[PDB]
Amino acid sequence: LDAELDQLLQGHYIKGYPKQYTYFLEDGKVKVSRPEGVKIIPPQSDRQKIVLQAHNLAHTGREATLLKIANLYWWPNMRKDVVKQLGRCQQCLITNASNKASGPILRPDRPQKPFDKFFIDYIGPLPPSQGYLYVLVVVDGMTGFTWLYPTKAPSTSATVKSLNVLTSIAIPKVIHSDQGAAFTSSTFAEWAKERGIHLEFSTPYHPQSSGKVERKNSDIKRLLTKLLVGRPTKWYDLLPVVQLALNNTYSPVLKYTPHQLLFGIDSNTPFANQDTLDLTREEELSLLQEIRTSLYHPSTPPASSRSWSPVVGQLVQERVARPASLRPRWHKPSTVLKVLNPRTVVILDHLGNNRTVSIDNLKPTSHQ
Template sequence: MTNDDSPSNLNEDTKTIEKTMQPVLTIQAQHISTPNESLMIMREGCNTKKKLIYLPSSLINDLLQVYHSDPLSGHFGVQRTYLKIKNKYWWPNMKQSITQYIQSCLPCQQYNISRSKKPGRLQPIPPPEGPFQLIGMDYCGPFKQTPRGNQYVLCLTDYFTRWVVAAAVPDCSAQTTAEALFNEYICKYGVPAVILSDQGTHFHNQLMEAMSKLVGYNHIYSTTYHPQSNGMIERFNATFVPQIAKLQDKENNNWDEFLLPVVFAYNTGTHSTTNYSPFQLLFGREPRLPTDGQIYSFTFRKPNDYYEQLKKSMKLIHGYARGNIIRKQHQYKTQYDKRRPDPHYAINDRVLIRRHGIKNKLEPKFSITPQIIIRAQHPVYVVRDEITQIETQVHINDIRPIYVSKLN
């Protein structure tokens, strides 16, 4: 016998079990001691008849506490709980009562992972009218440090042409971010109207705020833990990492030497959304590649003719590209929204929010304490913790309503 199995501990465990089972024992005792058959109900099926205890409404919660929340019941779902109860007890709308009770079980709401689609419809970002009006910015990494000291890649993607700029950098500090943005993008392509990024400290800081005011662009931030808000650059990151991994010399760890060739290959390939290459949408022509043969030249009567022809071509392909973007967004939204719930919450609604970065698998997946909706701009909400009063901005994807039992 171990210390944990001492008589005192066993007695405590026995008392706990007896206390938990008391409601059931009370119900069964009432049934045995009461000769009145009105407490019984007869169920027929499979050529058999069975007497069931008719449970009064005042005892339903006590019984469900034992059959669902007790350690020996395991917090299982509606069907398993119902099958355990139905052969012993009966009351009107029994399945509905069990469903409501389990839906309102707070531990189940905090720990259970829904197998249905996450709530919230897709909100596509309207395509800009032209290049460099809206760009997305994000970091990829860390990777293994190269001999040049690089560990991260700062990626910037134009939302109209899909033109990508990528810079290998040693870290993702605010100073490094500002320098790379200025040197690799602004000095080469001009100042974008809007930059979209996540709320990481490398983007959301005093230095970047000062730079946006000084240079003259609007910096907006996506919702925390909602990469779909900046989905285009997330998809590029998922594309270029495998390509670099295939090309790098693992012994010399020179992935940063292949970064620009991979970006060039991406920019000169036809994009599935626009049906044009980013290079063509930016420069009005296709690039000459090492595999190309004879160079074709065009003769214009006046030097200005080339400019006029280029302007017409750019206007034409930009119009086609924008139409293709809108069409693809509509197709993707239709597919994404199919059979997807889209609940709306009001001010003062009590909810739970998803907890990200949980490494311990036994930790609850949703907030331990309820959150109160204090600002609503669907699909983004601001919630306040009931205990700590901390305010958090959260997307509808990460919100779960709190169900409260309607049982007496």
């Protein structure tokens, strides 16, 4: 815009240019003596190219791009133009890291009854023990009661074999698992349908969603580690020992063991509780029904100083699962279709696929 800069040299006011400054012509270009020093005022038609040239030197953010521009030029609302370029730079949007934390975690309600929901997962590969490399961990959501199965692979065939032994005791309403090959197979879906079990899947690459079982994996590995100190890692024979030990371990916050929450009475194990000895099984089951309802439940923690919670229509970016060397950590922007809860969202990428993802695997696209 050379017509815009023409009236300026003359001396009449233009919206955005402070009238208290001296706008002259020198070396064939419009200049202004500013407190910082003499700067060139480029015509509006040149500004986009200037911002892009400065930004492209090192793909700098707002202030670092501005500081370069400001060395030579001045124009009204320079950062508005810098931010407009930052918001259009695909390389910056997909490579830069987020600086906004996810909103506070949800503490999903504890399943009401034993067998309402099982959390399943695999531990491994572990050092070989009798040809076995993996452990299928099955944690009952209400009680925390765990079943352990040694496997040669994290497969559907091994999961089905293990769960047919477990389901001889009782059948769960739901089986929650991550999106591992063993659990997402059509053969596993078919196995569950046959039994009336609903399969629930965690959002991709979010093990916190399977937190109930993940946390038990920690305890299983910790005990196996302790029992194998200064001995070869022959864990196979220890699985039944670890299962029984953990199922009979008190949770200091609950003041109950997973066994007690499942049966309301201790079996013949060391230090069995004898407090319901004079009660009848019915009186004991009545007290168990009361204990199961009054267990402590944690609540969502405070949001951090700079958290973000999803909004329908918002431009958001999914995290690249296994990013290759020197490749962006983020996918191209997507739009939030449905907000399932403040931590789970349905997105539509540029491809056109609907993905249910955790907000931990998303960043809000910068500069709107």
